[PDB]
Design a protein around this ligand. Structure first.
Ligand SMILES: *[C@@H]1O[C@H](CO)[C@@H](O[C@@H]2O[C@H](CO)[C@@H](O[C@@H]3O[C@H](CO)[C@@H](O)[C@H](O[C@H]4O[C@H](CO)[C@@H](O)[C@H](O)[C@@H]4O)[C@@H]3O)[C@H](O)[C@H]2NC(C)=O)[C@H](O)[C@H]1NC(C)=O
Ligand SMILES: *[C@@H]1O[C@H](CO)[C@@H](O)[C@H](O)[C@H]1NC(C)=O
Ligand SMILES: *[C@@H]1O[C@H](CO)[C@@H](O)[C@H](O)[C@H]1NC(C)=O
Ligand SMILES: *[C@@H]1O[C@H](CO)[C@@H](O)[C@H](O)[C@H]1NC(C)=O
Ligand SMILES: *[C@@H]1O[C@H](CO)[C@@H](O)[C@H](O)[C@H]1NC(C)=O
Ligand SMILES: *[C@@H]1O[C@H](CO)[C@@H](O)[C@H](O)[C@H]1NC(C)=O
Ligand SMILES: *[C@@H]1O[C@H](CO)[C@@H](O)[C@H](O)[C@H]1NC(C)=O
Ligand SMILES: *[C@@H]1O[C@H](CO)[C@@H](O)[C@H](O)[C@H]1NC(C)=O
Ligand SMILES: *[C@@H]1O[C@H](CO)[C@@H](O)[C@H](O)[C@H]1NC(C)=O
Ligand SMILES: *[C@@H]1O[C@H](CO)[C@@H](O)[C@H](O)[C@H]1NC(C)=O
Ligand SMILES: *[C@@H]1O[C@H](CO)[C@@H](O)[C@H](O)[C@H]1NC(C)=O
Ligand SMILES: [K+]
Ligand code: NA
Lengths: 481, 476, 477
């Protein structure tokens, strides 16, 4: 008596299918990465720039609270934290701030340099009194490290004129401010001239600022305001500053080097000496799976983020220790006793064997099925959040509509692919067992009684020799009938 | 003679499959909601705010045509109509109007309050002559209810300085205007001083305005212009207004409560005393279907909008009153006489029965298949159109490219899924019938003749026919 | 020794497709879904030629930059072509305010009429109209200027308050351009416009802007320390625009009455114009295809297949070519019959004296015809989709626009490549099914009268001639 049957094991792997959920299967692959090291890591060997208690504004202006960032020159990405609260210390408006954050997100390294050396650039103006209790440091009134708040020298503020020629071979980021006093008494005290102007021109930047005197609510005990400005000076170009008051002059500028794959993320994780190909605000990922459910914000080469809790793909068959009627059908159960293949035979004679041809073709096909569908899935490169000022609610909502829309498409695509192809993987195995069985019934013909549960009760007695004949596809029906 | 066959009924339900269109099937479910009550309803018990003939500007400024909106304090969504034509009655520019619309789209309730009480805040200026024929009410010249057009008092306009401290614990929306007269005679008549300014400053707002005198084409017979401005004053912050002319001063402001799920829609439907979980400009939807084709604009929890006319999913089989060769194959037709199941047996002996095991496993799987794909579809929360001014065409087109891209993908996903899985569901039934038949062929073996159309050498009564549903040797 | 056999088609095809279980599967018949061929040329759309800006860009064309004189008599087009040499824009340095928006507005203009809105010869009697030239806009070795603007200057040391209005009686929206000049010095301001403090005012019923010229020492661009800010507005039909100035006005000279169409746009291409008509135009060349997908270029004009990032989308229709789930094809029926030319599934007889089965074969064609059609319909054609432009303070919006384009393209490429992978398996299964059903159809007829070898052949236990073979194939046995 020869029987035909399929594999069973001690596996608890569950997948879901179109017709049935919580289907226990013999073998499966996880497609969804849910593990991370909970740390900030280097990316391709380059550590990120950690702004800590500072935000982008405080770093680029040189807020005294951020002095430890002053020597930073190259990074792989930028990390803000939940306590990145130090930006502008003196009240005002940072014009096109979010655009500057976008500019700095593709900066891989920069050279901070003294664009107008303090001790020699301003002989006719005071360079020593531009400090405020709003930018305190070490118990004293102080000021930004990258700006120089010029004031009158000996009751005079002559027309100032200073130029810089960009000989760096790179774009130079130039920052300045215009100070808006709270009274004309303050205007006279700081700059002498009551009717001031500031002009900033380059070959592609051209703005004139007229300071406004006004009574304002005090912010950090300050009724004045500084508006902060920035521009990118192209290589070879000149930028010209002219003023008779109220100029918060550039002191340090940045020659920028552009790179690929950087971005600004907000994380509470701590920096460790790890190296990763993929970084999230939650931690680093080490995986080749096509999907992750850890965070939508990613730095590097990452799996696509999806809103799923499980994405298990069946590769083996139903674990029983059907569209084609064999598995869980007329062959009621599986054989844990057969460990060496997915499909096989069981011989019971006087004197368990798995079929290698059918099992190796199934193994080949399922491997191509897993590989071919993961291939259609593409690596997620750097994708981060974006910031918008309080008059850009429509754009902010448009950006959120775009990100949520794609995330819903990819989550639907992923969950539905697995659900529908899991059911086709079980039908594939059921088909393989039904084809192996029928190939044995066309080989024995009249020489055996079909019991109907995958077994052929032999009428004659042939020992092991002809039993391998049945399996090998070399069984001689005439000799025994 | 015992036969194996499948169910048929008087159903005309049609589906489309990958290999054949217009396939009549025994049972199906519609996945596409196309019905609505044609009314505006409450959402979670809260009525919408109906602006009627007014648009957002006329309402929030207090255009005299909108007096009936003045007491409105809480709403679930905002309805403009095709006749929402009353906005600014005196001509000019409403600066960052579309942004204000976006801001108000997330307001669930507000408190309208007098930020500068008219009779006590302006002792040195006139509060009684700032009316215009462009904002007529009751046959007389009038003005906005939330603005106060100050003018000179006794031939002088002293420098004015007024401040408001937000003690409301909420953002306060403050609106004001700057008037730009058409001539210097008009400037002197209204404000005396020829060179005027308006300054409005807070802790995070800081703007100064110089009125501009120019000859302009008349709009509503007005050659002057008013620029309307707004800002959100944070809790605890102070806003200071300073001017020596041309100030349309704030009179009423709004303490705002933010909420989730609101929006502004344009509808011609009328309000009724219904409550709904889902509202569109055409009418409210009461459905659990994953899709609708009624409107892309939705308020609440709604089915996903798709551009399809039909999304019917086959649950039963082909209606005959195959991949596996049985249904519409060697079993050429179905049995209307069998009413109690999808697959069953028919006996003709000397002395119709549905199989419960095979039919209930088909029902269990088909139920899971419909439920499993409807879960993959997630409810649509509030999604409404947006507005852009005439220098934001690129942004407007980008918004339209985004909205169109998503709808083309979803319409494709839904239409293709139903098309492919319909063929797949009918194959499932063909497999169940071919598996039912083969289970019988191996039980009867040589004791019966297989006619080959799904259909006894001995004479076997009713008792033994249920045996199969069979001790072959015992009754051989 | 009389045998009917059941088989399937074979031919000499090298057509190859990919399947979810196997790659490089050679099939008998397949259809390409992916247009990769174009003519390499720019062509008319609906018989209307594009506007080739050539060495000029939108700014230089619309202002009338003298390098662009040859575009002046162009009145209608089907789309606008910039080239990689489209570098002539503003010739006098300055800022073209809201330029990208203006490009976006012209993308929808099908034709326009250029006309003297303020005729030079008669609109400015109290001002000079002949001295507003510069070496920055050189023409023919001489100082010249934009063809559509007029640089008004002082007349005999008098530049009086100027005021001119235009009432749009054209029935279409009118595009009006002007400039405001910002001189380098206080002397330049007096030398050109006399009055020290000047202003420009431009008001319509929906437009109200004022300009105050700013004098500042500036780096020279094209030998000019001054700057001009260029401006534009659309005057609605019946609306009136009014210019008032006391200097610094670069006045509108020619304006444009626009006709809006559908489906135009601006593309960058380096292909040459050729005398051809096309429903579909891309920067690389024109497409003539009914296929649903193309991989030529994402920019298109007209009605085009949808762009995907794919190198091959071939969809099997015929059979596995051998000269499955169901066990017949490449199963117990091991190989195919090149000798059965007129059908997908048929019979072979060995009598004493190949045949296609019409019924099962013509049903499989109808099914396969319907599958490929049903899939092509779900795909919709690409209407005009073009790139957008953004100035240097719109980097976030530029990226957001790219995240959108990149997002959709990835999704449609995934959709097309997964649809063909998965449905190619289903089609091969379908063919293994049709063969098996036919082979079991024959088996149930013969029952006891024939021995089943198991390779699709039935050796009939009686004698069976050409008449009895037709019985088996006809089903009349
Ligand atoms: C748009 O279409 C035109 C049409 O052909 C196309 O033109 C090509 O331009 C390139 C570059 O401008 C040409 O290139 C050269 O070929 C000559 C021989 O004719 C060489 O001598 C040149 O070499 C010199 O210069 C280099 C730069 O310094 C040096 O590195 C080099 O050692 C040489 O000194 C140069 O290779 C080319 O001839 C034409 N034509 C063709 C058919 O290529 C243009 O490129 C297209 N534009 C775009 C943006 O695609
Ligand atoms: C489960 O199977 C693995 C591999 O056969 C074996 O190493 C392990 O001991 C088994 N455990 C149990 C509890 O059966
Ligand atoms: C799923 O099946 C497992 C067997 O692997 C069982 O232990 C578990 O309770 C089941 N859970 C559900 C939710 O069906
Ligand atoms: C971030 O980590 C620090 C370290 O303990 C802790 O003070 C803070 O609560 C954390 N914040 C969040 C949001 O996890
Ligand atoms: C990532 O995981 C693999 C899994 O075996 C491991 O071999 C490899 O060392 C891991 N990489 C890092 C950087 O830890
Ligand atoms: C069709 O059959 C259903 C069975 O539920 C019955 O209710 C209905 O009345 C029938 N149609 C007609 C026209 O009688
Ligand atoms: C669908 O079939 C019915 C009858 O089978 C027919 O009356 C109807 O016209 C068909 N539908 C279409 C759109 O042709
Ligand atoms: C709404 O639908 C529910 C079921 O979801 C139904 O019970 C109820 O009658 C319907 N009511 C209205 C007003 O449509
Ligand atoms: C197959 O034979 C036909 C018959 O002439 C021929 O036209 C065709 O080119 C051949 N196949 C290939 C790939 O050339
Ligand atoms: C694919 O199969 C063809 C036969 O049709 C063969 O010539 C070729 O080398 C194979 N491999 C490819 C195309 O990479
Ligand atoms: C497009 O291709 C068809 C197919 O040969 C051809 O007949 C037609 O002339 C072509 N049309 C153009 C405009 O090239
Ligand atoms: K800002
Ligand atoms: Na506006």
């Amino acid at each position: 008596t020869i029987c035909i049957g399929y594999h069973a094991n001690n596996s608890t792997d569950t997948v879901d299918t179109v017709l049935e959920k919580n289907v226990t299967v013999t073998h499966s692959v996880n497609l969804l990465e849910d593990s991370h090291n909970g740390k900030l890591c280097r990316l391709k060997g380059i550590a990120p720039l950690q702004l800590g208690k500072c935000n982008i504004a405080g770093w680029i202006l040189g807020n005294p609270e951020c002095d430890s960032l002053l020597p930073a020159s190259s990074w792989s990405y930028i990390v803000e934290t939940p306590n990145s609260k130090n930006g502008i210390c003196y009240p005002g408006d940072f014009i096109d701030y979010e655009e500057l954050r976008e500019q700095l997100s593709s900066v891989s390294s920069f050279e901070r340099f003294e664009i107008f050396p303090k001790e020699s650039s301003w002989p006719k103006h005071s360079t020593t009194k531009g400090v405020t209790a709003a930018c305190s440091h070490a118990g004293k009134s102080s000021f930004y490290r990258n700006l120089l708040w010029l004031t009158k020298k000996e009751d005079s503020y002559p027309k100032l004129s200073n130029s810089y020629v960009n000989k760096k071979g790179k774009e130079v980021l130039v920052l300045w401010g215009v100070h808006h006093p709270s009274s004309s008494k303050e205007q006279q005290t700081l700059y002498q001239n009551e009717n001031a102007y500031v002009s900033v021109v380059s070959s592609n930047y051209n703005r004139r600022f007229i300071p406004e005197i006004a009574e304002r609510p005090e912010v950090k005990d300050q009724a004045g305001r500084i508006n902060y400005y920035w521009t990118l000076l192209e290589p070879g170009d000149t930028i010209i500053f002219e003023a008779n008051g109220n100029l918060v002059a550039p002191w340090y500028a940045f020659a920028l080097s552009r790179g690929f794959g950087s971005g600004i993320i907000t994380s509470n994780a701590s920096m460790h000496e790890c190296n990763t190909k993929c970084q999230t605000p939650q931690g680093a990922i080490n995986s080749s799976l096509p999907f992750q459910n850890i965070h939508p914000v990613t730095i590097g080469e990452c799996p696509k983020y999806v809103k799923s809790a499980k994405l298990r793909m069946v590769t083996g068959l139903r674990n029983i220790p059907g569209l084609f009627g064999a598995i869980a059908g007329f062959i009621e159960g599986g054989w844990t006793g057969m460990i060496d293949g997915w499909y096989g035979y069981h011989h019971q004679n006087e004197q368990y064997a798995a079929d290698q041809k059918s099992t190796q073709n199934a193994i080949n096909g399922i491997t191509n099925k897993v590989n071919s569908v993961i291939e259609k899935m593409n690596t997620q490169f750097t994708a981060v959040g974006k910031e918008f000022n309080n008059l850009e609610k429509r754009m902010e909502n448009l950006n959120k509509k775009v990100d949520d829309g794609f995330l819903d498409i990819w989550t639907y695509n992923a969950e539905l692919l697995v659900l529908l192809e899991n059911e086709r993987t079980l039908d594939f195995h059921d088909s393989n067992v039904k084809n192996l069985y029928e190939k044995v019934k066309i080989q024995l013909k009249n020489n055996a009684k079909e019991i109907g549960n995958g077994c052929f009760e032999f009428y004659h007695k042939c020992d092991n020799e002809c039993m391998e004949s049945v399996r090998n596809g070399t069984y001689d029906y005439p000799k025994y009938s």
